[PDB]
Design a protein around this motif. Structure first.
Motif, short mmCIF file in Angstrom:
data_model
loop_
_atom_site.label_atom_id
_atom_site.label_comp_id
_atom_site.label_asym_id
_atom_site.label_seq_id
_atom_site.Cartn_x
_atom_site.Cartn_y
_atom_site.Cartn_z
N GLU A 250 0.91 -1.20 -0.06
CA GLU A 250 -0.14 0.09 -0.13
C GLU A 250 0.65 1.27 0.03
O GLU A 250 0.37 2.30 -0.42
CB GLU A 250 -1.04 -0.08 1.18
N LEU B 152 3.20 2.02 -2.10
CA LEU B 152 3.38 2.40 -3.59
C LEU B 152 2.29 3.23 -4.08
O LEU B 152 0.97 2.87 -3.96
CB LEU B 152 3.54 1.12 -4.52
N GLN B 153 2.54 4.66 -4.18
CA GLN B 153 1.79 5.71 -4.76
C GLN B 153 1.22 5.42 -5.88
O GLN B 153 -0.16 5.55 -5.88
CB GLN B 153 2.40 7.08 -4.37
N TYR B 154 1.71 5.39 -6.72
CA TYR B 154 1.25 4.90 -8.39
C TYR B 154 1.48 3.47 -8.47
O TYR B 154 2.40 2.93 -8.48
CB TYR B 154 2.07 5.79 -9.30
N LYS C 56 -0.94 12.67 -7.61
CA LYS C 56 -1.35 12.47 -6.22
C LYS C 56 -0.92 13.13 -5.30
O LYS C 56 0.24 14.11 -5.56
CB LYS C 56 -1.10 10.96 -5.97
N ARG D 181 -6.74 5.77 0.98
CA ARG D 181 -5.50 6.24 1.45
C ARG D 181 -5.35 7.86 0.70
O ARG D 181 -5.35 7.76 -0.29
CB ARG D 181 -4.49 5.31 1.15
N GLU E 173 -3.12 9.48 0.19
CA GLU E 173 -1.81 9.69 -0.67
C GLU E 173 -2.30 9.04 -2.25
O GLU E 173 -1.44 9.32 -2.73
CB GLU E 173 -0.62 8.70 0.02
N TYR E 174 -3.25 8.52 -2.12
CA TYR E 174 -3.72 8.05 -3.64
C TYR E 174 -4.71 8.81 -4.48
O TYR E 174 -4.77 8.74 -5.54
CB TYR E 174 -4.58 6.61 -3.70
#
Ligand SMILES: *[C@@H]1O[C@H](CO)[C@@H](O[C@@H]2O[C@H](CO)[C@@H](O)[C@H](O)[C@H]2NC(C)=O)[C@H](O)[C@H]1NC(C)=O
Ligand SMILES: *[C@@H]1O[C@H](CO)[C@@H](O[C@@H]2O[C@H](CO)[C@@H](O)[C@H](O)[C@H]2NC(C)=O)[C@H](O)[C@H]1NC(C)=O
Ligand SMILES: *[C@@H]1O[C@H](CO)[C@@H](O[C@@H]2O[C@H](CO)[C@@H](O)[C@H](O)[C@H]2NC(C)=O)[C@H](O)[C@H]1NC(C)=O
Ligand SMILES: *[C@@H]1O[C@H](CO)[C@@H](O[C@@H]2O[C@H](CO)[C@@H](O)[C@H](O)[C@H]2NC(C)=O)[C@H](O)[C@H]1NC(C)=O
Ligand SMILES: *[C@@H]1O[C@H](CO)[C@@H](O[C@@H]2O[C@H](CO)[C@@H](O)[C@H](O)[C@H]2NC(C)=O)[C@H](O)[C@H]1NC(C)=O
Ligand SMILES: *[C@@H]1O[C@H](CO)[C@@H](O[C@@H]2O[C@H](CO)[C@@H](O)[C@H](O)[C@H]2NC(C)=O)[C@H](O)[C@H]1NC(C)=O
Ligand SMILES: *[C@@H]1O[C@H](CO)[C@@H](O[C@@H]2O[C@H](CO)[C@@H](O)[C@H](O)[C@H]2NC(C)=O)[C@H](O)[C@H]1NC(C)=O
Ligand SMILES: *[C@@H]1O[C@H](CO)[C@@H](O[C@H]2O[C@H](CO)[C@@H](O)[C@H](O)[C@H]2NC(C)=O)[C@H](O)[C@H]1NC(C)=O
Ligand SMILES: *[C@@H]1O[C@H](CO)[C@@H](O[C@H]2O[C@H](CO)[C@@H](O)[C@H](O)[C@H]2NC(C)=O)[C@H](O)[C@H]1NC(C)=O
Ligand SMILES: CS(=O)(=O)c1ccc2c(c1)nc1n2C[C@H](N)[C@@H](c2cc(F)c(F)cc2F)C1
Ligand SMILES: CS(=O)(=O)c1ccc2c(c1)nc1n2C[C@H](N)[C@@H](c2cc(F)c(F)cc2F)C1
Ligand SMILES: *[C@@H]1O[C@H](CO)[C@@H](O)[C@H](O)[C@H]1NC(C)=O
Ligand SMILES: *[C@@H]1O[C@H](CO)[C@@H](O)[C@H](O)[C@H]1NC(C)=O
Ligand SMILES: *[C@@H]1O[C@H](CO)[C@@H](O)[C@H](O)[C@H]1NC(C)=O
Ligand SMILES: *[C@H]1O[C@H](CO)[C@@H](O)[C@H](O)[C@H]1NC(C)=O
Ligand code: NA
Lengths: 728, 728
Positions: free
Chosen positions: A206, A208-210, B220, B620, B622-623
């Motif tokens: 989780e 990993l942003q992209y 993001k 989340r 950050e997404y």
């Protein structure tokens, strides 16, 4: 009252099958892991010593995934940092430990991210693949010799397979082959330059942003395929020349006229190699037999030694043309091929004579050739009792073919009807592995007199446990349809009462050459469904199924999604006729090809099935890979077989799903049957207003095999089946 | 006994609200499409003429999507080949028809795949954007002047917004602003060079063999943002021989020190433009007021005319700093800003004075400024009866602020408590749109004495239909938490019996500045649930909700997934203690922000809810995108707000889902809330062994709005809720 075999039992592996995995290191010694020690066993007497103490690599600082001893026993290859790729492929780090010096090697190390490594068959040479190029080390501590310079990620593969060769052709990541004494190294090179990419998201942890886009060269049916070349290098010349030449062996003209595959590589002698090539239309194969010419340094394949293998009724081989087994002098070989009656039997060839001699015959098939000595050939078949789902070891006298001895048939006929075997290096000993119908049994035997030496593992621990459990039973039998026997099995609840009506789940695979009716002992989801839920779990081998001759196997040629589907429906009707089946509670399920058949059945309008579950199904043949798909379907072109490609999709039956309860399941990172396949199913069902149940598995592949996901899917499917069957 | 409002009624739009969508073309006349004929109405008398016959384009050859008549009435712009992009963006083809010579222009046509087109506000000039560049046509049949040459797909955007500016800042694809008489054309240019791309699969029609990977520049939270520049060009001094000169207006030094946004563009006069800029930390904004210098041809923005707008408690503006409303001379302006009590009210600014004067005040808010004359300013507010979820039109006497007149409050107090308005060009007339609590009511009025001229549409046809349906009612009321009133609404079943226990579904959004408790009449899924299934559908506006001042709205600043989630649990807790609610049957659902809140609630361990449904949820922060997320959350850095980004995720609550039934739904082509967000939720639940229900929608976006998918999702959700509540 004895407990039943529950879902938690299955998911937690509380009742564990014991195995006996040994590794022959010679003609009379094998390695065995016991308590994290590696023991070496003497086959003749059964006595052992410690080969490598469990504490040897405590201060290694890495968890060792696997190990590999060099043929001369001088070195051990230590595999760690294991990162799985596809079904067979993975990358790893490797250290080499010097056994006689009791020291790890610290110079000229195998690099990290190595794709494949293999010892030479003799001594301790190494070949490895790193960044898609081949390297050879003559000595473990000395510099490597680079063999190829063309390696390019996703583009050029030297000594390793691309996606489709790994999955469909070689069943291995490795595409290199040492000659028997290690002088030559043969290898294939795959060019995927114009092969299209499948692209899908991978979400990862989780953090990993992209999401990552995974991109794999993957030819779908009719698409541009990888091209292939084959080379042999003399590794004995490496320390003598700056850059040893890889000598190419070109495919025959009959292959070069069109798209083709390399489908087999087998060394015959120190200076003789055999190669089989297959046309993209997979009913024509050609074996070349090529000799090293000492004066030119080239490899020549005499047309007098070229062997054609073709099929008028289907494709060549079960899943590919069979491998040859050469006599020591390399002047003849044995090969399983389909006889005039369509049954697969052992044929004996002289290398320079086109007509072979069948050495076995009958209405049953040879499964594999297991060993060959100067006097005997050893093979597995389903001859015993005319049971296609049994497996036994036989031995045939080469000087008298009428002398055929069944080595395993009568050892324990009640407990043991399915055998595989493991021979020592020169076949002086063999390990028999019985896998059913009783508990697996592992035994050791001497070839000189075929006497049993000892029982290795009898699963008495498990037997003891299972005594306190209401276990289900298994029926293996046949029904006669159109004057042909078709075999089925049933997992039957404990205390099965023929006067009662049970819910039935049809467990389906039904792919070409499949076999779901056999004598194997399994502890699985079906065991729980029968034991705890009182569900009969049945499987049926209809048209297209394997090990029963070509008339049955080739019945679905150019016609997937037809007879194999119909025969599952017919099987369910026949099971109803038997009188212990509740016609109101018949369900169907399958994974992979079984998910395709399940979906086709549920969309048939048959009215036979209340509900069903497809996991990672094929939905449309144009979405699946070229090598597998085209073998059975030909090409999706108007001039070949496009009409049937378009007629056999799940999506075209969407409207009929209004009659059934459907659960569709797919892993999002399935590189094999792309999530696309179920994405198109769901959309077609949405478009006709059909309600269904769905579940995706984030970052799971075709196996849905991570511990958590495996438990989650079977738990989810159990609720679904129980709901359908009105089970509390 | 009469019918109920059924799921099919909702899905098939059986009971349709009538509208009266008019387009003011002057101070005295409007256009209205009636039976495909465009009519022109006189506002004073209500007489009409046919402006354009429906038959005019009988042989046009394309289905026309929309039309746009030039301000002078001489031309009509015909829109066709519409292809949707994001929430506001799309491309189309265009033709121009000459209304006087009754012919299509065939010379120098607007190109296909045009991204934006707009008439000048006066006359009939056109500006359009095609391939990310701006073009101007002085006359519809004449060649275009190319204004910009730097346009580049996914990189340089001239006169159109990128993904995030479209969604989050301008709520439009256009980034063009004509001056009041069309002399100047102002535009923004966006640079997304270093903005990362979200990537996801698009499966398309079944015929597509390989899925497509869609790639969209999308920042993001915390990621590299697009950069922005602003230009003004003189469209009166364009040349065929020389490229156009665009004059840059640079951002103030207080913005240039770091990341920032252009957030508003508003022309004041023929030669005066205002711009508001916003820091990436969105609690500081600056307005520049810029004047054209005729001798230099430059635009100068005097520092004496800068206006700073900042917040000590949260971000600036409701979702962005508000638009200014300039007087005729452009020497002063009116703007809604938060007062010292944190209530949004109208402030009056002089262009070169720092202090503004609040012209309205009280514990209620101005929603928008609607029209301005030299004597009155017309605005919408929720003052009436202190109801935050009601809306009325007021006018305030600019010479005496104590003289405020409500223009809609008393027209029909029982039927009409929520109004919007459309004024004619110089505010001589206005159309009022009542949207509840009764059926929508459209009326026309004249400003001079606020006469109610006529009823335009009263929905009496719908009224007659609904008389024969058992319709639900709506209760709007409040509860007190910690001395503060917070409002809720309940959609109550027909024949509501306070002595019976009903199941309750909590319908949630609860994003910052949201309002789910109001006086609007709606025919939706909740209508069906109440009318047919006898379920109370409740919504609650807690901390973070809008239109009630900053004390409430900014309560969730830097802390999303806290008080707004807690307050939904508290409301439900309170509802569950009411005599008419079945505390064993309380459910929760939401979409988008509401999906996040639903998921946080269900993972809270509260024990209040039996089941819930999350549709396209954030999981989340950050997404999600930078502009929206950072407004409330700041930056996800250790130095700013990373800790709260990390503990406000759905995934961390996975274990708490063990005692609830959860249905998780998401479109695979969601460009807004990426499928990723639900993929990470499902993986977390799998990892802790929690069973749940799932549904993906292939190729659907955030709206899940295709006709078939819309029906499918509401069908699937209805089965889930009914199952949860034990409803047949
Ligand atoms: C198993 O026992 C055999 C027989 O004792 C071992 O073989 C050798 O036995 C002779 C006795 O005459 C001794 O010289 C050595 O101790 C043994 N040497 C070898 C060849 O190993 C044998 O070692 C045992 N095998 C294992 C794997 O422990
Ligand atoms: C792999 O195959 C490709 C063809 O797909 C080869 O690439 C071509 O190489 C020649 C040079 O000999 C060029 O003229 C072409 O432009 C290339 N075609 C394409 C499509 O790229 C490539 O050389 C092969 N690689 C190896 C190592 O065999
Ligand atoms: C070893 O020999 C091989 C084969 O001759 C060399 O590979 C060639 O390299 C040149 C120039 O780098 C290319 O133009 C050819 O296309 C290559 N052919 C092949 C088969 O790859 C390789 O570079 C040599 N290595 C060294 C160290 O000289
Ligand atoms: C392994 O086999 C190779 C190939 O036959 C042997 O190499 C040949 O050895 C003979 C000597 O009998 C020579 O006449 C040839 O020059 C060699 N040919 C090549 C291609 O190298 C090799 O000696 C064998 N290795 C071992 C360890 O026995
Ligand atoms: C928009 O697209 C249409 C179709 O591509 C263009 O109109 C012509 O269409 C016919 C067939 O419909 C083609 O033979 C021509 O190539 C098209 N162009 C010409 C020469 O008229 C139309 O031109 C496009 N619109 C603009 C303004 O570019
Ligand atoms: C729209 O406004 C512009 C700017 O005020 C007008 O352009 C000016 O017109 C005057 C005539 O009095 C000229 O002396 C100026 O040189 C013009 N300025 C610029 C910047 O061009 C324009 O005429 C107005 N247009 C209409 C139709 O009213
Ligand atoms: C705009 O918001 C930021 C962040 O809340 C405020 O800047 C400081 O933020 C750091 C950590 O991000 C804290 O150490 C300080 O407490 C904050 N500033 C203060 C109050 O000294 C910033 O102050 C806000 N700007 C305005 C105009 O209020
Ligand atoms: C509505 O009615 C008015 C007055 O009855 C219409 O008439 C005015 O404009 C016409 C041209 O559009 C002329 O024919 C009339 O002479 C003129 N009358 C006066 C004295 O103002 C008006 O056009 C009508 N409006 C519409 C949109 O049809
Ligand atoms: C758009 O922005 C980029 C920066 O994000 C500009 O390119 C600059 O940044 C490059 C790195 O990506 C540098 O190497 C260059 O020095 C710099 N300029 C050049 C020559 O590209 C880019 O110019 C911007 N484009 C426009 C039209 O403004
Ligand atoms: C018996 S065998 O020669 O070892 C052999 C080789 C390759 C084999 C196989 C059996 N069985 C399968 N495959 C590869 C093939 N990709 C497998 C497969 C088939 C499908 F239709 C499918 F959808 C997925 C899938 F993984 C089944
Ligand atoms: C009132 S307004 O200024 O017009 C305005 C402007 C932009 C707005 C909005 C209201 N409401 C939203 N947005 C943009 C925002 N991306 C919207 C949204 C928020 C989420 F948390 C989300 F998950 C999805 C989503 F689409 C809600
Ligand atoms: C493998 O990687 C590790 C960790 O990055 C490194 O310390 C080691 O040197 C590597 N081994 C080789 C053979 O390069
Ligand atoms: C191989 O298959 C194709 C398609 O069925 C057929 O036309 C061709 O004749 C076949 N070849 C052989 C050797 O039977
Ligand atoms: C206008 O600008 C473009 C791009 O900079 C250039 O290629 C073109 O030739 C210019 N035209 C004139 C008339 O200078
Ligand atoms: C070594 O293996 C394990 C510890 O890893 C231990 O249980 C076992 O007793 C050890 N081997 C011996 C000497 O028995
Ligand atoms: Na009136």
């Amino acid at each position: 009252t004895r407990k039943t075999y529950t879902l938690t039992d299955y998911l937690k592996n509380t009742y564990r099958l014991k195995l006996y995995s040994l590794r022959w290191i010679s003609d009379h010694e094998y390695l065995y892991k016991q308590e994290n020690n590696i023991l070496v066993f003497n086959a003749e007497y059964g006595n052992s010593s410690v080969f490598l103490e469990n504490s040897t690599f405590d201060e290694f600082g890495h968890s060792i995934n696997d190990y590999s001893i060099s043929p001369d026993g001088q070195f051990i290859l230590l595999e760690y940092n294991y990162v799985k790729q596809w079904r067979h492929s993975y990358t790893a780090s490797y250290d080499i430990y010097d056994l006689n010096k009791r020291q790890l090697i610290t110079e000229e190390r195998i690099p990290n991210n190595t794709q494949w490594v293999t010892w030479s068959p003799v001594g301790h040479k190494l070949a490895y693949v790193w960044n898609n190029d081949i390297y050879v080390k003559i000595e473990p501590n000395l510099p490597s010799y680079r063999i190829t310079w063309t390696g390019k990620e996703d583009i050029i593969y030297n000594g390793i397979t691309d996606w489709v060769y790994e999955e469909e052709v070689f069943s291995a990541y490795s595409a290199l082959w040492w000659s028997p004494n290690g002088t030559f190294l043969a290898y294939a090179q795959f060019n995927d330059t114009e092969v299209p990419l499948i692209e899908y998201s991978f979400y990862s942890d989780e953090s990993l942003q992209y999401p990552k886009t995974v991109r794999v060269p993957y030819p779908k049916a009719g698409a541009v395929n990888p091209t292939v070349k084959f080379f042999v290098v003399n590794t004995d010349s490496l320390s003598s020349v700056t850059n040893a030449t890889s000598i190419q062996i070109t495919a025959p003209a009959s292959m070069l006229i069109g798209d083709h595959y390399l489908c087999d590589v087998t060394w015959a002698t120190q200076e003789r190699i055999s190669l089989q090539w297959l046309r993209r239309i997979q009913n024509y194969s050609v074996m070349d037999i090529c000799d090293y010419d000492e004066s030119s340094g080239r490899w020549n394949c005499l047309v007098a030694r070229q062997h054609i293998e073709m099929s008028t009724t289907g494709w060549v081989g079960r899943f590919r043309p069979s491998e040859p087994h050469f006599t020591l002098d390399g002047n003849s070989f044995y090969k399983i091929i389909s006889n005039e009656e369509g049954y697969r039997h052992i044929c004996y060839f002289q290398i320079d004579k086109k007509d072979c001699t069948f050495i076995t015959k009958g209405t049953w098939e040879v499964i594999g050739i297991e060993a060959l000595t100067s006097d005997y050939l050893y093979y597995i078949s389903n001859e015993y009792k005319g049971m296609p789902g049994g497996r036994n070891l036989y031995k045939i006298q080469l000087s008298d073919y009428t002398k055929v001895t069944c080595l395993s048939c009568e050892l324990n006929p009640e407990r043991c009807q399915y055998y595989s075997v493991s021979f020592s290096k020169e076949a002086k000993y063999y390990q028999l592995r019985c896998s059913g119908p009783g508990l697996p049994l592992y035994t050791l035997h001497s070839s000189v007199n075929d006497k049993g030496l000892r029982v290795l593992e009898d699963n008495s621990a498990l037997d003891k446990m299972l005594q306190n459990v209401q276990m289900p039973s298994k029926k293996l039998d046949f029904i006669i349809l159109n004057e042909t026997k078709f075999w089925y099995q049933m997992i039957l609840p404990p205390h099965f009462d023929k006067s009662k009506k049970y819910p039935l789940l049809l467990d389906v695979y039904a792919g070409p050459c499949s076999q779901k009716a056999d004598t194997v002992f399994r502890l699985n989801w079906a065991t729980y469904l029968a034991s705890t839920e009182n569900i009969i779990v049945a499987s049926f081998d209809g048209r297209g199924s394997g090990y029963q001759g070509d008339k049955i196997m080739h019945a679905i040629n150019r016609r997937l999604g037809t007879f194999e589907v119909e025969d599952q429906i017919e099987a369910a009707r026949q099971f109803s006729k038997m009188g212990f089946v509740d016609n109101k509670r018949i369900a169907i399920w399958g994974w992979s090809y079984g998910g395709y058949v399940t979906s086709m059945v549920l969309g048939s309008g048959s009215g036979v099935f209340k509900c069903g579950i497809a996991v990672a199904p094929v939905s449309r043949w144009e979405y699946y890979d070229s090598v597998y798909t085209e073998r059975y379907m030909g090409l999706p072109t108007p001039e070949d077989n496009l009409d049937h490609y378009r007629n056999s999709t799940v999506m075209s039956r969407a409207e009929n799903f209004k009659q059934v309860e459907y659960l569709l399941i797919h892993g999002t990172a399935d590189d094999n049957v792309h999530f696309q396949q179920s994405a198109q199913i769901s959309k077609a069902l949405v478009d006709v207003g059909v309600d269904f149940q769905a579940m995706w598995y984030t970052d799971e592949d075709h196996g849905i095999a991570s511990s958590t996901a495996h438990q989650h899917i079977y738990t989810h499917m159990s609720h679904f089946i129980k709901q359908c069957f009105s089970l509390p």
